[PDB]
Amino acid sequence: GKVKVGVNGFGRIGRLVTRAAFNSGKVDIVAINDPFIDLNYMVYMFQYDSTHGKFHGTVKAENGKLVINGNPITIFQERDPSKIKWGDAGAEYVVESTGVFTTMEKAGAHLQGGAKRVIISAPSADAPMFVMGVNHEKYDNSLKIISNASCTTNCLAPLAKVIHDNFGIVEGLMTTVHAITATQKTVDGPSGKLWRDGRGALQNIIPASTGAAKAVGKVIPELNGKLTGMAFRVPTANVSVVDLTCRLEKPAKYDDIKKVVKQASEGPLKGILGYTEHQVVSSDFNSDTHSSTFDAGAGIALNDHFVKLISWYDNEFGYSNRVVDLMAHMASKE
Amino acid sequence: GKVKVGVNGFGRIGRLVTRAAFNSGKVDIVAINDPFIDLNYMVYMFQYDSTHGKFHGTVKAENGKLVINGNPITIFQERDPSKIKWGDAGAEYVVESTGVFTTMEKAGAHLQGGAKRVIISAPSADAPMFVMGVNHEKYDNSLKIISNASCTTNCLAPLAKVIHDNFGIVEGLMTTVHAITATQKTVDGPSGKLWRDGRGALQNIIPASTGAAKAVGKVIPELNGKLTGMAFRVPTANVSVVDLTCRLEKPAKYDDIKKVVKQASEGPLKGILGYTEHQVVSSDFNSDTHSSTFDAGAGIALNDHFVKLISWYDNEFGYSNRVVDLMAHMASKE
Amino acid sequence: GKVKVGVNGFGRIGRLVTRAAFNSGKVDIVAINDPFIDLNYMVYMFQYDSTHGKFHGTVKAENGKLVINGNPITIFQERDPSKIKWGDAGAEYVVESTGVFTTMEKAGAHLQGGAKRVIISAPSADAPMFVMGVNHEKYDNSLKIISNASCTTNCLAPLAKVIHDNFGIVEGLMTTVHAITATQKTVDGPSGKLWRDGRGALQNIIPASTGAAKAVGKVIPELNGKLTGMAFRVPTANVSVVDLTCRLEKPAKYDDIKKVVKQASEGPLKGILGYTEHQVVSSDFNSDTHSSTFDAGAGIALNDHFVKLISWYDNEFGYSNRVVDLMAHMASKE
Amino acid sequence: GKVKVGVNGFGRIGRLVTRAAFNSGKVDIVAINDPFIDLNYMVYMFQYDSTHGKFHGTVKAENGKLVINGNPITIFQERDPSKIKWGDAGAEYVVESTGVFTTMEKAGAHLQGGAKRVIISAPSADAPMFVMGVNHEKYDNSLKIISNASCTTNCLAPLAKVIHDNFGIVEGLMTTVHAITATQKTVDGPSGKLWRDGRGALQNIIPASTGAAKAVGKVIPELNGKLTGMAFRVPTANVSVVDLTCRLEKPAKYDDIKKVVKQASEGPLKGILGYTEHQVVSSDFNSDTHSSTFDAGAGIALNDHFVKLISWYDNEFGYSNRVVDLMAHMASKE
């Protein structure tokens, strides 16, 4: 009864989503589209990974199809999304991960090819946004084009939801120390709009602006206009962290915050929000599937109404697993 | 009329202080003490630097003395500070930079050797603390043992002073993204008290606790009990940054904050607090002598009473130059 | 019938040897000695690893013993090796991994405590050296104190043995690009004898001298006086590589070399010497248990008598697994 | 009497060539062409540099011209090289640094715009190659399109020339440990032909093939067919090194090699080939203008006919300075 999924784009997010789908088994990948990557290169790129290690399984090419663990996958090389024959391959859901089709009008071209629903693995200007464990109960089958927001938003939303439900956030500012991404450059090089983003990634911290904190207001309507922040890009492979400073409506000692966060991570947000009291560092969360992990020992509170909270997140694996979970929930809602 | 200065310890801070003194010419180094470094090794370590490049000048050993730019320097190899003959070498002021003699009782052993005053280049539990441009006018000749605080405190204090004087800080929390230091380790290794500090510096962000924000209260009495924060250690050579989130008593748009900071950096805090509107990154502040540089474009404000401000600082060169400036002011006060 | 093993020192090599022993099951660890690491710190250090990830299993402290996968381990904190009661704990073989007891006289102190045989996990000036798959058949029960050489030697020896047996090496020079180790320093710092080794590991290549190529002559007597080389230390976590340039006695096209290396890696040196024709990079060999992997595509030959060969090796996991294998062979020889 | 020079492309090589020309004063830049970089971005990119620091001077835009140290520079934005009006701007020599016009036919389009001679700052398949201090005396005014080879070739050629002239190289194999370049990628990403080059630059060593050693045969005809090698790309900012293993015709102890290299570096190859006996590392050669620096202490010799030599080179500054020197010599030859 597992839904059939097609993936548009074999970049980092697409490859990691395919890996998560094959590791968990919640969905079945049946088609992939990439106009610039051939079959043998696809096999090479899927087999080896610098950050997450060698794939645990078998991958090979046979009769022009990518075979992963014995399951053949159809390969397309179309540049126009409306010309991809998703229906012929049997793909019911399509994951749009290229990062250039984010509006509803642009992302709706996949429906012309026979797909039933489209999931955008990035922030969208007009498509509805859903975060697993926060507002995923709001989804309905009436929706064909939705969005899974972003990694930073997926890390910030559950902790913010717990804190707001228990103590009433009045206003907060967020800072995230983020690992390097594919949009950056090894050495000083041209960068059209963001001049800072063109500087050498290995030698600098390159501050940056982000909209995840604002998008939390879209995910949680009561927090609209009460959050915002920025980011710093450090020369680290993948693991990233979130730092939230907020003012609370009700008094809250740090012990009470720890207790409520642990209780939330146990029952309701199990597998989404983690909790740890150990002396962890960034590399301890490599290949971790949690959306966010609360670091009890790293935070600090000035008084009962002004605190700073720290949460870790693997911006590669966690987001891909969340995408797979959202697709599984959508299939169950059918 | 320049004062004669002796340096205890030839570590990073001691070498950088010697470099700053010879580059600026405000003071004259006449003696150095290090029990574990010989003369030729001293020449090698002073001549070459991975972060700040080759020394611009001449350094060599002659008749058992270190000769820098033609000035001979006496070399000691004593382990007990009370046995160093500072007075015989002619040293009037002594810079204690080993990091293990920080209390007044421990640091006062240098006075037995003939030194007149002692400056501790690190936070002290009981010695008075001074920050140039903030409270250095409070110093008096009655003081023999004082402290120059720390780099992070030197970065945070001037900006906090300007903001408090103009808008009345009510409470703030600080986060600093800090470059790696000598106390860290290349690969996972033992670390007695701070378990996180023993993890590999090249692979992790290793969160950490700090007291610079609290020490700002000591430097600025009106801010006592209103500041605190923590730090993240990233795999960068030297340049570091400060991120301050605070609530203001009076309304303040971001333009007004920019105007007041620029005005302060022009007249009163010239050479101590910088100001820039360019798209800078961390490497742009290598070998910069400012205590802190305000990054106008990187900050963000939620509303008129809740803002986040960003300031850069070279934690190696700026602190050394501040130490030299403090010694020059002390000599002028004689 | 598995032999009981005690480990002296809980550094990188000791921890990795314990991990390899518990992962493979060839031997049983029953005792560990470290005077500077307590029990809880031992649990923390064994549980988490920046390079090889979290330990797959359970580790905890109970009644003053380290319990790994349900097996209790006695803990000692002696500084004098002759005072360690190895016999009381039941340890028959002892692994000396501290790096400071490498001579036969120094390493023989463990025999006074009740140990039967001692294995030095480092090069020794006078103890016999053995490399698995090269000369491990030379060992006899008459030996109580032996040596497993070093990682670089373990990588170079099998390939050199195959090449010499098939084509007759006349003379060769080796260069190894090595990852950073615990003896290096994060920032420019003092280093007694090796001045280059004290420079910042994150910013430089720091050339270095090594004796592994010469030690290959000890392991393979026919190659005595025909090999030597040096090393470069690059800012990488662990994976390292070997580059061997040699002149051959008999003509040998590159295809013949590839064929003989593949044949050797299949039958006789299975699990010790690997072979690959893929476009691999350094991270593809993380946690690989091979002593050396021949990179067919990376090498180059000037003519039929002058070639350059490339081999990869994980200098952490491979050496530890080789130590465990040597101990297992010694136990079987009893 | 200084020649007027135009630069095609404002990438790394073009910007560094402009910097070298303005620092040395041997030539005068009067025009620059880049279709994708505007004037203000050009000012920003020239002013700030992560590797070599802030430009020592003044740069600004005025009346649509780039003004450096008071000298206005014409700016073009043409994509077709034949449409650039080099003659109108007064450019007599043109530096082709885009890396895509390397053949004589492609590079000759600049002559249609009014340029007199074209210098290709990269290896060329059919244009004559010149290396300063090796064969630059072979140039004649009859040549309009020539080549300056490459950085690695410029490092290897002078040392090889000295060694061949003094001892008669019979055959040699070269390995270079190279810093990261703009063609690499921060995270695992697509790379059309070179699959290894698409892997993450910050996490791997990524072996690679090169033709500099073969090109040395073109520069030095007597060494044709006697040299070749490969490269390793390490995660370092810029400084790179060369490692040459060769067999000598005549006996040569290491002391004799050191003596001849020092003598060559003093008189004939002054400013091109350096010599050092200190314990240097890679960062000690940042912004060094030498083509190659011989590291006496790092090399090793197996016997009197088989040696390994080490030479350092800044692959950014040295090559740019060599390009400027070649243009100055060409102008003098007029």
SS (H, E, C) B164-212: HHHHCEEEEEEEEEECCCCCCECCCCCCCCCCHHHCECCCCCCEEECCH
Q: C271: left (phi > 0), else alpha (psi -120 to 50), else beta?
A: left
In terms of DSSP bridges, do strands B59-62 and B65-68 run parallel, antiparallel, or are they unpaired?
antiparallel
Contact B142, B116 (CB under 8 A): no
Tokens of C98: 């501290």
CB contact under 8 A, B236 and A171: no
Distance from A277 to chain D by nearest Cα, in Å?
29
Q: What is the DSSP letter of D157?
A: H
Closest CA in chain B for residue A308: B173
Residue with structure tokens 């209103």? Answer: B226
Rounded to 5 degrees, what are φ and ψ at A208? Answer: -160, 160
**D278 touching B, CB under 8 A?**
yes
Cα dihedral B273, B277, B278, B282 in deg (nearest 10) = 40
Q: Are B239 and B179 in contact (CB under 8 A)?
A: yes
How many other C-beta atoms lie within 10 A of the C-beta of residue C319? 26
* Distance, first Cα to last Cα, chain D: 11
User: Please, how many CA atoms are within 13 Å of residue C22, restricted to the half-sphere of its CB?
Assistant: 21
Cα separation, A306 vs A172, in Å, equals: 10
CA atoms within 13 A on the CB side of B39: 16
In angstroms, the Cα distances linking D170 to C304, D73, D134, D296, D310 are 14, 50, 19, 22, 18
Q: Is B151 a catalytic residue?
A: yes
Q: How does D159-186 read in b/e, with b if 16+ C-beta sit within 10 Å? A: bbbbbbebbebebbbbbbbbbbbbebbb
| CA distance linking residue B253 with residue C301, whole number of Å | 69
Task: Give Cβ neighbours of residue D88 (< 8 Å, ≥ 6 apart).
Answer: D114
Alpha-helical regions (H) of chain D:
12-24, 39-47, 86-89, 104-107, 109-112, 151-167, 212-219, 254-266, 317-332
CA dihedral D119, D122, D124, D127 (to 10 degrees): 20
C308/D contact by beta carbon, under 8 A: yes
**What region does A238 belong to: left with phi over 0, alpha with psi -120 to 50, or beta?**
alpha
For the record, the structure tokens of A30 come out as: 């049946």
Q: Which residues contact B126 (CB under 8 A, 6 or more apart)?
A: B103, B104
d(CA C283, CA C237): 9
What is the rounded distance in angstroms from the CA atom of residue A137 to the CA atom of residue A157?
15
3-state SS string over chain A?
CCCEEEEECCCHHHHHHHHHHHHHCCCEEEEEECCCCCHHHHHHHHHCCCCCCCCCCCEEEECCEEEECCEEEEEECCCCHHHCCHHHHCCCEEEECCCCCCCHHHHCHHHHCCCCEEEECCCCCCCCECCCCCCHHHCCCCCCEEECCCHHHHHHHHHHHHHHHHHCEEEEEEEEEECCCCCCECCCCCCCCCCHHHCECCCCCCEEECCHHHHHHHHCHHHCCCEEEEEEECCCCCCEEEEEEEEECCCCCHHHHHHHHHHHHHCCCCCCEEEECCCCCHHHHCCCCCCEEEECCCCEEEECCEEEEEEEECCCHHHHHHHHHHHHHHHHCC
| Dihedral over alpha carbons C132, C133, C135, C138 (to 10 degrees) | 80
Tokens representing residue D218 in the block: 């073109």
H runs (alpha helix) in B86-184: 86-89, 104-107, 109-112, 151-167
Phi, psi of C170 (to 5 degrees): -95, -40
Shortest distance, CA B283 to any CA of chain A (angstroms): 6
> Considering A66, A151, A169, A227, which one is annotated as catalytic?
A151
The answer to whether A38 is a known ligand-binding residue is no
Tokens of residue C315, six digits: 């200098």
Alpha carbons within 13 A on the beta-carbon side of B326: 34
Experimental method: cryo-EM
Quick one: which of A105, A312, D30, D276 has its CA closest to B207?
A312
List the single residue in B203, B283, B303 with the smallest CB-CB distance to A204. B283
CA distances, A62 to each of A67, A73, B81 (Å): 7, 10, 76
Question: Chains contacting A with at least 3 CB pairs below 8 Å?
Answer: B, C, D
Positions of D marked catalytic: 151
Contacts of D224 (CB under 8 A, 6+ apart): D217, D218
Q: Is B236's Cβ below 8 Å from some Cβ in D? A: no
Chain C hits for A48, CB-CB cut-off 8 Å, are: 278, 280, 284
Gap between the Cα atoms of A286 and A293, Å rounded: 12
Residue A199 CA neighbour count, 13 Å, CB half: 28
Residues of B in contact with C200 (CB under 8 A): 50-51, 237
Collapse the DSSP code of C118 into the 3-class scheme (helix H, G, I; strand E, B; otherwise coil) and give the result: strand
In this complex, the chains that touch C, judged by 3 or more CB pairs closer than 8 A, are A, B, D
Q: Which among A163, A153, A93 has a CA at the least distance from the CA of A318?
A: A153
> Any chain D CB within 8 A of the CB of C45?
no
Separation between Cα atoms, residue D331 and residue D334, nearest integer Å: 5
Pairing of strands C28-33, A207-209: unpaired
All residues of chain C having their beta carbon less than 8 Å from the beta carbon of residue B186 are 180-182, 184-186, 201
DSSP for D248-311? ESS---HHHHHHHHHHHHHTTTTTTEEEE-S---GGGGTT---SEEEETTT-EEEETTEEEEEE
Computed from CA positions of residues D46, D50, D56, D58, in that sequence, does the dihedral angle turn out positive or negative?
A: positive
Between helix C317-332 and helix C12-24 the angle, nearest 10°, is 60
Please say whether the beta carbons of B216 and B153 come within 8 A: yes
Residue C211 distance to chain D (closest CA, Å): 12
Nearest to A248 by CA among C92, B196, B247: B247
d(CA C311, CA B139): 64
Grouping H, G, I as helix, E, B as strand and the rest as coil, residue B141 is coil
Query: Which amino acid, one-letter code, is at A126?
Result: D
Return the bridge partners of C171, or none: C247
Q: Please, what is the angle between helix D12-24 and helix D317-332, to 10°? A: 60
| CA quadruple D125, D130, D134, D139: dihedral sign | positive
Name B138's Cβ contacts closer than 8 Å, sequence gap at least 6.
Answer: B130
CB proximity list for B287: less than 8 A, separation 6 or greater: B52, B314, B317, D53
A19 known member of a binding site: no
Q: Is A210 annotated as a binding residue?
A: yes
Check whether B79 is labelled as a binding-site residue: yes
Taking 3-state DSSP, the helix, strand and coil percentages for chain D, each rounded to the nearest 5, stand at: 30, 25, 45
**D 181-210 residues inside an 8 A Cβ radius of A:** 181-182, 184-190, 195, 199-204
Euclidean distance between CA atoms D70 and D58, whole angstroms: 8
Interface residue of D12, D42, D187, D197 to substitute, partner A, most A CBs within 10 Å: D187
Residue pair B208/A300 in contact by the 8 Å Cβ criterion? no
Check if D50 contacts C (Cβ < 8 Å): no
- Phi/psi for A283 (5° steps) reads -65, -15
D48 closest CA partner among A233, B278, B299, A205? B278
Inter-chain residue contact D239 with C295, CB threshold 8 Å: no
Alpha-carbon distance of B212 to B154, in angstroms, equals 9
User: How many CB atoms neighbour CB D232 within 10 A?
Assistant: 23
Domains contained in chain A, CATH given = 4-127 (3.40.50.720), 151-315 (3.30.360.10)
CA distance C94 to B224: 58
At residue C89, what is the residue type? A
Q: Which residue has the tokens 């120059």?
A: B148
Q: Residue C229 has which token pair?
A: 């080389």
Chains touching D (at least 3 CB pairs under 8 A) are A, B, C
D319: distance to nearest CA of chain B, Å?
Answer: 20
A77 contacts A103 by C-beta, under 8 angstroms:
no
Evaluate whether A307 touches A169 at the Cβ level (below 8 Å): no
What distance in Å separates the CA atoms of residue D163 and residue D264, rounded to the nearest whole number?
A: 10
Interchain proximity B180–C187, CB inside 8 Å: yes
* Neighbour-count burial for C141-161, b at 16+ CB within 10 Å, e otherwise: eebbbbbbbbbbbbbbbbbbb
A50, A188, A237: residue with CB nearest D49 = A188
Pairwise CA distance, residues A52 & A22, whole Å: 15
Side-chain half-sphere CA neighbours of B145 within 13 A: 19
Interchain CB distance below 8 Å, D283 and C203 = yes
Q: What is the resolution of this structure in A?
A: 2.0
Closest partner CB to A50 (pick from C54, C278, C283): C283
As a whole number of angstroms, the distance between CA B92 and CA B25 comes to 16
CA-closest candidate to residue D244, choices C175, C185, B113: C175
CA distance D101 to D9: 11
> Residue D145 CA to chain centroid, in angstroms?
17
Q: In chain B, which residues have their Cβ closer than 8 Å to the Cβ of A206?
A: 281-282
- Do residues B29 and C183 touch, judged by C-beta distance below 8 A? no
Give which of B153, B168, B154 is closest to B228, Cα–Cα.
Answer: B153
- Angle value at C-alpha C159, between C294 and C233, nearest 5 degrees: 70
Separation between Cα atoms, residue C200 and residue C233, nearest integer Å: 11
For residue C159, give the DSSP letter. H
- Any residues with CB less than 8 A from the CB of C160 and at least 6 apart, and which? C169, C172, C216, C220, C223, C227, C244
| Contacts with D160 (C-beta within 8 Å, 6 or more apart), sequence order | D169, D172, D216, D220, D223, D227, D244
Between CA B135 and CA B153 the distance in angstroms is 13
Q: Amino acid identity of A212?
A: A
- Give the minimum alpha-carbon distance from D237 to chain B in angstroms, rounded to a whole number: 12
Nearest to B236 among A205, A295, A308 (CB): A205
Angle at C102 between CA C96 and CA C103, to 5 degrees: 130
Cβ(D188)–Cβ(D200) below 8 Å: yes
CA distance C136 to C161: 13
Residues whose CB is less than 8 angstroms from the CB of residue C141 and which lie 6 or more positions away in sequence, other chains included: C333, C334
E strand or H helix that includes residue D120: strand D117-120
For B156, list phi and psi in degrees, rounded to 5.
-75, -35
Cα–Cα dist C42/C51, whole Å: 17
3-state secondary structure of B91: coil
Adjacent-strand bridge partners of D33: D8, D76
Tokens of B78: 């004593």
Q: DSSP state, B236?
A: -
Contacts of B187 in chain C (CB under 8 A): 12, 50-51, 180-182, 237
